[PDB]
Design a binder for this molecule. Structure first.
Ligand SMILES: CCCCCCCCCCCCCC(=O)OC[C@H](COP(=O)(O)OCC[N+](C)(C)C)OC(=O)CCCCCCCCCCCCC
Ligand SMILES: CCCCCCCCCCCCCC(=O)OC[C@H](COP(=O)(O)OCC[N+](C)(C)C)OC(=O)CCCCCCCCCCCCC
Ligand SMILES: CCCCCCCCCCCCCC(=O)OC[C@H](COP(=O)(O)OCC[N+](C)(C)C)OC(=O)CCCCCCCCCCCCC
Ligand SMILES: CCCCCCCCCCCCCC(=O)OC[C@H](COP(=O)(O)OCC[N+](C)(C)C)OC(=O)CCCCCCCCCCCCC
Ligand SMILES: CCCCCCCCCCCCCC(=O)OC[C@H](COP(=O)(O)OCC[N+](C)(C)C)OC(=O)CCCCCCCCCCCCC
Ligand SMILES: CCCCCCCCCCCCCC(=O)OC[C@H](COP(=O)(O)OCC[N+](C)(C)C)OC(=O)CCCCCCCCCCCCC
Ligand SMILES: CCCCCCCCCCCCCC(=O)OC[C@H](COP(=O)(O)OCC[N+](C)(C)C)OC(=O)CCCCCCCCCCCCC
Ligand SMILES: CCCCCCCCCCCCCC(=O)OC[C@H](COP(=O)(O)OCC[N+](C)(C)C)OC(=O)CCCCCCCCCCCCC
Ligand SMILES: CCCCCCCCCCCCCC(=O)OC[C@H](COP(=O)(O)OCC[N+](C)(C)C)OC(=O)CCCCCCCCCCCCC
Ligand SMILES: CCCCCCCCCCCCCC(=O)OC[C@H](COP(=O)(O)OCC[N+](C)(C)C)OC(=O)CCCCCCCCCCCCC
Ligand SMILES: CCCCCCCCCCCCO[C@@H]1O[C@H](CO)[C@@H](O[C@H]2O[C@H](CO)[C@@H](O)[C@H](O)[C@H]2O)[C@H](O)[C@H]1O
Ligand SMILES: CCCCCCCCCCCCO[C@@H]1O[C@H](CO)[C@@H](O[C@H]2O[C@H](CO)[C@@H](O)[C@H](O)[C@H]2O)[C@H](O)[C@H]1O
Ligand SMILES: CCCCCCCCCCCCO[C@@H]1O[C@H](CO)[C@@H](O[C@H]2O[C@H](CO)[C@@H](O)[C@H](O)[C@H]2O)[C@H](O)[C@H]1O
Ligand SMILES: CCCCCCCCCCCCO[C@@H]1O[C@H](CO)[C@@H](O[C@H]2O[C@H](CO)[C@@H](O)[C@H](O)[C@H]2O)[C@H](O)[C@H]1O
Ligand SMILES: CCCCCCCCCCCCO[C@@H]1O[C@H](CO)[C@@H](O[C@H]2O[C@H](CO)[C@@H](O)[C@H](O)[C@H]2O)[C@H](O)[C@H]1O
Ligand SMILES: [Ca+2]
Ligand SMILES: [Ca+2]
Ligand SMILES: [Ca+2]
Ligand SMILES: [Ca+2]
Ligand SMILES: [Ca+2]
Lengths: 218, 218, 218, 218
């Protein structure tokens, strides 16, 4: 209809998208300020009133956007994300506030250069599914072995399957791998390094190949 | 013979290989569950009975695979590995259980994309034999020097040749290289950094070249 | 005029530029010596007198350089920097001395190979503005979440927005990310790793892409 | 002369070079064994007698090699190194033994693949002289500033110019940069991170470019 054309010439207009960008930035600063407990004592009413106005504007904006292109909305991942973050931040007023902080990625969603770069980073991922699965299998296997080997005398670190996964991820990142893990272990299990030095070697060699493999796809 | 043809049309069939894959995954989950001591109190008989059934199936499968292509079996590295892991997990019921956890790499062996990627990672290795030998020689030489220099007043870290190898591998990875090693050393040996700063420099420069050399072979 | 030509055949002469280089090097050594408190007790008058002579020479040199090409001087970034560092080191005799130490980058400014390489390093930067903005937004968002999640029971590290920024930069560099932060946190907040393991993953994946993206522009 | 031809057909023969290689390997194992204090109690006379025989053989070998091609000997870097290490290990029987351990790099010198790879690693270095000089200047400048800023209240780490160089190299490698340095500093100097976060940023950005620049020369 004639009115459908007009609201789409508003929605797909550069200005309306720029306005939702401005609301996003003001809102994000607001969230930066809301951590300041003294600032909150000073301006809780002003900021919270502001929050309510910006969220209502956001909700009606998502509604109009759903109107213009319905099928396109729920098969487009950026609008899918915008829908999902606003819905998350729509519920009546614990961890939900922490997620509400994610509304600021809508600044990625709105800004075309930000879209270009995020889709670039995601387009890198398919190629390394093979190595992510290899590494996941590897971590699972060594985690079970480390749990059954050190989990009893070292419950804090290898006690269960999760704690072992975590200590193996920590060892892979390199963080206190020896003075923190392998050397305290060796006070009781002196050939513990047979388990970790090969583990280090494989992880790094794989992690280095993953980085190499990223490049060649250029 | 006519029967030899039929069992090979089963063995090299997509379905039989997929079945051994399914047994592998169920088994791997089982090994994940067997760490849960309460779950083990609950279902030790069910899981262990399951273990026995899956291992017998695996053994007869390795037998049939050896039948179809004997010479091909012991010159193929993937089947060599499958033979070796099942043989490891075949002995009567300490560290053997920990190895038995390696049966899950048979999931790498069975899955063609997993084969492709592992053979890729191995095909990277020949080219860097030269640098691995250089680095091994380097580590040996500096390990002997560090043992003879700090091994007496620092027995925990450089006392023997092994402890020195380990502290040098730890220093190469970077982990607590200073606050943990070089700075405590300098409380007694104040020009210990003449030994380590050059050591750091050479190791990293070599480690960076090894990464570079990997790429160019593309 | 005839005299303007002569002073420009001095200023743009290889020798005058080499002389200001020599003054820079002598001065830099002087600053190296001035840290030695015993050396300062010995030669405070000689070095400080030297400082005054070299700085006056520098000031009149910047004056003549401004004369030869005025518009060119304040639109050229290297001379802009030379102007700014000498002006910084021109004020009557706390933190100003620490900045005065930056006069030694004038050795970068004077030396053509140094110019070539610094302009190379700067020419790398435009291309990664997109990712620097993405990462800044990311750090802001996770910093607000970490402040509101751990800032109360962990004021030292996530108490305000700044301390959270710092602990997140520290976690990104990898330094004591677990034994130092995430594991002490988990003594009180046991699913704190839901916040950090994804955070680690995104940061590294982005940091690795930033390195990759640098290369391709070759 | 006719005899000069024969000894050169021995010296440049594959067999004579292989023999000095064998002596090198036996000797290197000997040095590995000499760290074992119980093994030394057992076989000090056998090993030391062995040492004397192998070193005399080495000396006469260096003499003959100097004979065949004199000018070529002192302008060739590999033979220069062989001369220098044997001369080092030639003096009458403290730190000299530690250097004597370097005789094992003669295994690099003798082995052609080892020569190829070491000359490759050295051939990488000229191209990065520019950045090594930039980084050295950078380290000098920030070291002077850090000494004058934190050297008094933190003598252990920034007290002199050397301790500052070391703490800056440690911070560059990343090792305990925060929990170990910057955070203890901030207990007294709360805006110390203005000095280190920029320092980190520049170092890494430069260190990443140095790695990139290595590649392109392919
Ligand atoms: C992209 C660049 C981002 C730049 C962000 C830089 C943030 C720096 C934060 C510095 C905070 C430290 C200063 C400070 O002294 O902390 C105190 C304040 C609030 O005081 P507070 O701790 O509430 O005092 C309580 C005292 N009591 C309990 C006894 C009553 O706590 C604060 O000061 C918090 C200050 C809020 C700063 C908000 C900045 C928003 C930047 C927006 C960037 C663009 C967004 C797209
Ligand atoms: C860094 C801050 C994040 C903020 C998020 C903000 C909201 C983002 C949600 C929507 C994301 C949209 C991304 C996207 O559209 O991906 C497209 C990519 C590359 O597209 P493109 O380069 O156009 O090529 C696609 C082929 N074509 C042209 C024929 C269409 O092609 C693909 O999508 C390939 C499929 C890859 C799926 C990978 C899954 C990502 C993993 C999720 C992260 C897990 C964290 C632990
Ligand atoms: C770009 C996409 C990335 C790749 C795809 C997704 C990567 C993650 C897939 C990993 C699948 C396994 C996740 C998992 O095993 O979760 C279990 C544990 C549960 O921990 P929990 O028992 O609650 O730990 C508490 C520790 N304690 C005792 C001290 C209180 O939670 C953990 O401990 C998680 C530890 C890190 C998991 C990462 C393991 C390797 C991931 C795959 C390798 C790719 C490169 C890292
Ligand atoms: C590839 C992705 C892998 C995903 C793996 C994620 C694993 C997460 C493990 C989380 C474990 C922590 C939860 C927990 O509360 O621990 C307790 C349980 C067993 O309790 P338990 O510690 O035995 O209680 C004893 C109490 N007592 C001594 C007083 C009687 O200990 C456990 O909960 C162990 C839980 C077993 C989980 C097994 C998951 C198998 C995933 C299969 C993936 C595909 C394989 C190819
Ligand atoms: C992709 C293939 C990888 C390259 C080929 C294989 C690499 C390994 C070859 C190294 C050859 C030497 C192995 C070796 O020296 O083993 C001896 C020691 C024995 O340790 P031990 O005396 O039992 O240590 C206990 C420590 N303590 C006193 C605190 C209880 O055990 C250790 O300490 C091992 C320490 C790490 C050894 C790595 C040394 C450099 C390896 C070559 C360099 C390539 C990049 C790293
Ligand atoms: C680019 C390569 C740069 C090379 C730089 C190497 C610097 C090495 C610094 C070594 C310092 C440690 C030696 C030492 O024992 O420290 C003491 C001295 C001064 O003694 P001091 O600590 O004042 O004694 C006070 C005793 N008291 C309070 C009881 C009266 O404190 C000092 O020794 C400071 C020594 C000044 C060395 C200046 C070297 C300038 C190199 C110029 C490079 C080219 C510049 C473009
Ligand atoms: C090549 C160009 C580089 C990229 C452009 C510039 C990068 C920096 C842009 C970051 C914008 C935000 C800076 C910022 O948030 O400053 C606020 C805080 C204030 O700290 P403050 O509250 O005074 O901290 C004291 C800590 N305490 C409680 C223990 C005493 O100060 C900090 O904590 C700073 C912490 C590091 C900030 C870096 C954050 C990510 C930067 C963007 C990511 C690019 C790769 C890192
Ligand atoms: C390239 C690959 C290199 C492979 C190197 C692997 C080295 C592993 C070293 C393991 C050392 C730890 C074993 C151990 O229990 O230590 C004790 C022994 C000597 O005993 P010691 O500590 O003297 O006993 C004294 C007892 N006391 C004071 C009360 C009388 O101390 C020793 O055991 C030292 C053992 C010497 C091993 C020498 C191996 C040479 C490998 C040659 C490689 C090729 C060279 C080109
Ligand atoms: C890793 C274990 C080390 C063990 C050492 C054993 C003894 C080694 C001493 C002798 C080294 C000989 C190296 C060498 O010949 O370098 C030649 C390189 C590359 O040669 P090439 O690739 O043939 O190209 C040269 C051009 N051409 C064909 C016309 C001659 O061309 C160049 O030489 C260019 C000049 C570069 C000088 C760089 C100085 C190296 C820094 C020293 C390390 C400092 C440590 C902190
Ligand atoms: C491939 C070739 C590599 C590049 C060319 C050579 C690189 C080294 C050139 C650096 C020139 C300056 C060397 C220097 O400043 O030496 C002075 C100090 C003296 O230390 P000292 O005062 O004896 O320290 C004792 C510490 N204490 C108080 C706790 C007992 O000794 C130190 O602290 C040395 C600390 C590390 C020096 C490295 C500085 C940056 C080097 C250039 C950057 C290239 C990438 C790192
Ligand atoms: C959603 C994002 C997708 C996830 C996949 C992206 C990769 C994530 C990897 C896990 C991150 C931890 O990253 C960890 O960084 C350290 C840095 O010391 C690596 O250690 C590194 O050493 C060498 C030497 O520099 C590198 O060339 C190599 O990349 C890596 O092995 C660990 O091997 C790696 O695991
Ligand atoms: C079976 C696998 C084959 C084994 C060979 C594969 C390589 C294994 C190397 C040993 C693993 C430890 O890896 C260790 O990672 C750290 C990460 O801080 C490296 O430190 C790194 O600093 C720079 C800067 O990022 C990197 O460009 C470089 O790759 C490396 O020198 C150590 O130099 C490296 O030794
Ligand atoms: C003015 C300069 C411009 C600033 C921009 C330049 C980049 C600066 C980045 C911040 C510096 C800290 O750098 C930090 O180094 C560690 C090394 O363990 C990285 O950890 C790394 O793991 C893998 C494995 O090696 C690398 O391939 C990757 O580059 C990186 O993710 C952190 O992810 C990175 O953030
Ligand atoms: C390449 C970039 C280099 C930038 C370098 C910046 C690094 C800064 C190093 C840490 C310096 C802090 O050192 C200095 O500490 C003193 C006291 O100790 C503070 O002094 C302050 O004390 C209190 C606190 O507000 C006030 O009442 C007082 O009036 C004020 O002077 C200074 O404000 C700070 O400058
Ligand atoms: C004789 C040899 C010649 C000497 C020159 C060779 C280079 C030596 C550099 C000094 C070695 C210390 O190496 C130190 O490794 C750490 C690894 O966390 C680097 O940290 C790294 O973070 C990122 C992310 O991975 C890397 O892409 C980058 O290479 C580097 O900045 C430090 O920035 C680097 O300085
Ligand atoms: Ca790391
Ligand atoms: Ca580290
Ligand atoms: Ca490391
Ligand atoms: Ca690091
Ligand atoms: Ca490091």
């Amino acid at each position: 209809g004639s009115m459908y054309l007009r609201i789409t010439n508003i929605v797909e207009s550069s200005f309306f998208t720029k306005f939702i960008i401005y609301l996003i930035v003001l809102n994000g600063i607001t969230m930066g300020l809301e951590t300041s407990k003294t600032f909150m004592q000073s301006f809780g009413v002003y900021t919270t009133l502001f929050k309510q106005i910006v969220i209502t504007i956001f909700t009606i904006e998502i509604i109009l956007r759903i109107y213009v292109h319905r099928i396109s909305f729920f098969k487009d991942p950026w609008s899918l994300f915008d829908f999902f973050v606003v819905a998350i931040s729509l519920v009546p007023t614990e961890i939900l506030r922490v997620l509400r902080v994610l509304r600021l990625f809508r600044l990625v969603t709105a800004v075309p250069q930000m879209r270009k770069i995020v889709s670039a980073l995601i387009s890198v991922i398919p190629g390394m599914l093979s190595v992510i699965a290899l590494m996941t299998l590897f971590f699972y296997i060594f985690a079970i072995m480390a749990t059954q080997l050190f989990g009893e005398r070292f419950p804090e670190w290898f006690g269960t399957l999760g704690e072992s996964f975590y200590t193996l991820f920590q060892v892979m990142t390199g963080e206190s791998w020896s003075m923190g893990i392998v050397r305290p272990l060796m006070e009781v299990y002196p050939y513990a390094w047979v388990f970790f030095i090969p583990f280090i070697f494989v992880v790094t060699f794989v992690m280095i190949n993953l980085v190499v493999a990223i490049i060649v796809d250029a």
